[PDB]
Paper text:
[name] is a receptor for the cell surface semaphorin, Sema4D. pmcThe plexins are a family of cell surface single transmembrane domain receptors for cell surface and soluble semaphorins. The extracellular domains of plexins consist of three domain types: the IPT domain (immunoglobulin domain shared by plexins and transcription factors), the PSI domain (lexins, semaphorins, and integrins), and the sema domain. The sema domain is a seven-bladed β-propeller domain, with a large insert which gives the sema domain a distinctive, asymmetrical shape.
The crystals contained two copies of the complex of mPlexin-B1 with [name] in the asymmetric unit. [name] binds to one face of the sema domain of mPlexin-B1, on the opposite face to the N terminus, and does not overlap the Sema4D binding site which is located on the top surface of the semaphorin domain (18). When the structure of human [name] bound to Sema4D is compared to the structure of [name] bound to mouse [name], it can be seen that there is no overlap between Sema4D and [name] indicating that the VHH probably inhibits the binding of Sema4D in an allosteric manner. The mPlexin-B1 interaction surface on [name] is mainly composed of residues from CDR1 and CDR3, together with residues from the N terminus, and the C′ as well as the G strand. CDR1, CDR2, and CDR3 are all well-defined, with an additional disulfide bond seen between Cys50 and Cys108, serving to anchor CDR3 to the framework on the C′ strand. The interface of mPlexin-B1 with [name] buries 892/904 Å2 for chains A and C, respectively, or 4.2% of the total surface area of mPlexin-B1 (20–535). Visual inspection of the overlayed structures identified His34, which forms a hydrogen bond between the side chain and the backbone carbonyl of Tyr31 in CDR1 as being of interest. This residue is a tyrosine in human [name], and inspection of the crystal structure indicated that the side chain of the tyrosine in human [name] would clash with CDR1 of [name] in the complex.
Residue numbers in the entry:
A (entry chain D): 1 to 124
B (entry chain B): 25 to 177, 180 to 299, 317 to 514, 520 to 533
Write the structure that this text describes.
């Protein structure tokens, strides 16, 4: 059963830290490029951070520069989104997806598989 | 040598035109026309496409708000007598015909496909297998094995579909009776391995669950259908087992492809657990147990002569075996309106192994012949290519091992180069041409006989370690020498 699990979401105090994780099962993500996305209520699902299969290329979304951090562990089949700083406008359901498309790059336009998402809420 | 890469994009399938030698590669969001030397001749984009498995094609955004940018890994890639068959993972697995020689020229794409033209599996983690044949008047036919995909908005596992229907807008459809009618597609979870043709029948290797069994467990089956049967009356299913099941899950299989014999009659199967294993099922033993299973369920109510239940109706279908006359099979060898169908042998075809590989999980098989020696090429889940000699001796001898890409499974689509001098090997992100005879490497005798390959030996006439066919002179075999230097 090919699956992606998201963990770590919850409620936080602005300026707070939080570590989300994306565990894969039913397949090895060693040769996939993994990307984190988010969807706030009403708005369209934007992308947050992306990483290549080697971890050598990471690309950000402008709103989270120097605040959010992606990292991958191929042997653990998990990927982590270290979210520091933290904003009321950061509140959304954060999805995690994997692509088999140009995996030596950190593009993350299209996706092969998606996670069900975990909500991160920041008190206004 | 030469290698093909796509900036890390995954390669799903590979197909070769036996007429031109051109290679077709089906990748994520890509279609590649490659020369025999893996030189790019054309590129077509299967494109990242905004889609959802909960919407129907064509996708009008307004009626599919759940759509997200979706990747299109290739699901099917087959070479028909006049066109390239291409089905993707996206858009409910619809297909299209394209010109061999210029894959960019689209040939046929139904404009409003119906629910009967959803051919391939629409989940990139579920596999689709296919086979192209001819009907009774020459019509091009597509036989498709398709695993169970859940979200889909129920496609039968095995279907016969028309490639040249009268109306070109009805292409890739099946007459409602040219299908395998399974009830609980989710409780049998079909996982398809390969599909091949023998004489006037098509065969399918796949794993499904024996719902009548402990833990409703997955078993390995082969199934047969008359190519002409537009109603699947002829459908039979045998379970396949190697060593009772110490391993017990067929992962890949192939028949011996060689210059002398293009498609042999023995099916070399790879099982996994952890230890893997390679077994031989002679295809006349498959046709025997299939025929025995037909005769039993047609004539002796699924029971044998002693009275043991041997055959049975398959898959929740509401039929029963029969007491039809004994000449019924010799009069309706492909079934009829009122012959039992579909059928399954309760008795498996067992094989004892011919080779064990301890820490190996085999993923791909391919077999050929050099002289009278039979040689197997085996890929594993770690990107390794094992070369093995079975031949006219006894007990297999693994004689070489290479690493195509570390930790990347090898694709089952192992194809030869037509002169059978090379093997095309792919590892998720890399496709390489591989010499079957790496003899030239060694240029003195002690080397040619140290590195021991059934293809290679020392031509003393020339100054070369070569194949035998490259000397009628004196040539010292590297495998069983017999002499020295
Ligand atoms: C099985 O039956 C078909 C037709 O009834 C026949 O052509 C074929 O040779 C048979 N196979 C064996 C192994 O007896
Ligand atoms: C009945 O005969 C079949 C021959 O195909 C064999 O499989 C089975 O073991 C026999 N049953 C008994 C009780 O001998
Ligand atoms: C699909 O449409 C555009 C096409 O460029 C794409 O960029 C966007 O991410 C997708 N949006 C929706 C709502 O499907």
């Amino acid at each position: 059963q090919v699956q992606l699990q998201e963990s770590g979401g919850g409620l936080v105090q602005p300026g707070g830290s939080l570590r989300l994780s994306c565990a894969a099962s039913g397949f090895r993500l060693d040769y996939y490029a993994i990307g984190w996305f988010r969807q706030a209520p009403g708005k369209e699902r934007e992308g947050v951070l992306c990483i290549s299969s080697s971890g050598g290329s990471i690309n950000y979304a402008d709103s989270v520069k120097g605040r959010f951090t992606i990292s991958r562990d191929n042997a653990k089949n998990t990927v982590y989104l270290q979210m520091n700083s933290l904003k009321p406008e950061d509140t959304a359901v954060y999805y995690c997806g994997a692509s088999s498309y140009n995996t030596q790059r950190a593009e993350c336009y299209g996706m092969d598989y998606w996670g069900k998402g975990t909500q991160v809420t920041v008190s206004a | 040598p030469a290698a093909f890469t796509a900036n890390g994009t995954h390669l799903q399938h590979l197909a070769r035109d036996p007429t031109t030698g051109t290679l077709y590669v089906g990748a994520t969001n890509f279609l590649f026309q490659l020369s025999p030397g893996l030189q790019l001749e054309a590129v077509v984009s299967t494109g990242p496409v905004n889609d959802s498995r909960d919407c129907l094609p064509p996708v009008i955004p307004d009626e599919c708000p759940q759509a997200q940018p979706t990747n299109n890994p290739n699901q099917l890639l087959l070479v028909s007598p006049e066109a390239l068959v291409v089905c993707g993972s996206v858009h409910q697995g619809i297909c299209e015909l394209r010109s061999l020689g210029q894959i960019r020229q689209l040939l046929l794409r139904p404009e409003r496909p119906g629910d009967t033209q959803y051919v391939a599996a629409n989940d990139p983690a579920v596999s689709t297998v296919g086979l192209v044949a001819q009907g009774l008047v020459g019509e091009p036919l597509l036989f498709v094995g398709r695993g169970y995909t859940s979200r889909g908005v129920g496609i039968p596992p095995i279907t016969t579909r028309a490639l040249r229907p009268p109306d070109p807008q009805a292409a890739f459809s099946y007459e409602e009776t040219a299908k395998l009618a399974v009830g609980r597609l989710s409780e049998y979870s079909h996982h398809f391995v390969s599909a091949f043709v023998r004489g006037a029948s098509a065969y399918f290797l796949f794993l499904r669950r024996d719902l009548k069994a402990p833990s409703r467990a997955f078993r390995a089956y082969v199934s047969r259908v008359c190519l002409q049967d537009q109603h699947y009356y002829s459908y039979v299913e045998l379970p396949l087992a190697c060593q009772g099941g110490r391993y017990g899950l067929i992962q890949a299989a192939a028949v011996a492809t060689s210059k002398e014999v293009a498609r042999g009659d023995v099916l070399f199967a790879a099982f996994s657990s952890g230890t893997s294993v390679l077994c031989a099922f002679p295809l006349d033993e498959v046709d025997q147990l299939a025929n025995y299973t037909r005769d039993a369920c047609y004539t002796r109510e699924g029971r044998a002569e002693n009275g043991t239940k041997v055959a049975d109706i398959a898959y929740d279908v509401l039929s029963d075996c029969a007491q039809l006359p004994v000449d019924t099979p010799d009069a309706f060898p492909c079934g009829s309106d009122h012959t039992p169908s579909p059928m399954v042998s309760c008795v498996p075809l067992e094989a004892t192994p011919i080779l064990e590989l301890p820490g190996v999980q085999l993923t791909a098989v391919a077999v050929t012949m050099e002289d009278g020696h039979t040689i197997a090429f085996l890929g594993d889940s770690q990107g390794q290519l094992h070369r093995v000699y079975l031949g006219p001796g006894r007990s297999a001898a693994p004689y070489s091992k290479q690493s195509i890409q570390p930790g990347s499974p090898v694709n089952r689509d192992l194809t030869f180069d037509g002169t059978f001098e090379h093997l095309y090997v792919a590892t998720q992100t890399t496709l390489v041409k591989v010499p079957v005879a790496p003899c030239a490497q060694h240029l003195d005798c002690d080397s040619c006989l140290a590195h021991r390959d059934p293809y290679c030996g020392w031509c003393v006439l020339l100054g070369r370690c070569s194949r035998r066919s490259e000397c009628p002179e004196q040539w010292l075999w590297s495998f069983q020498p017999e002499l020295g230097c």
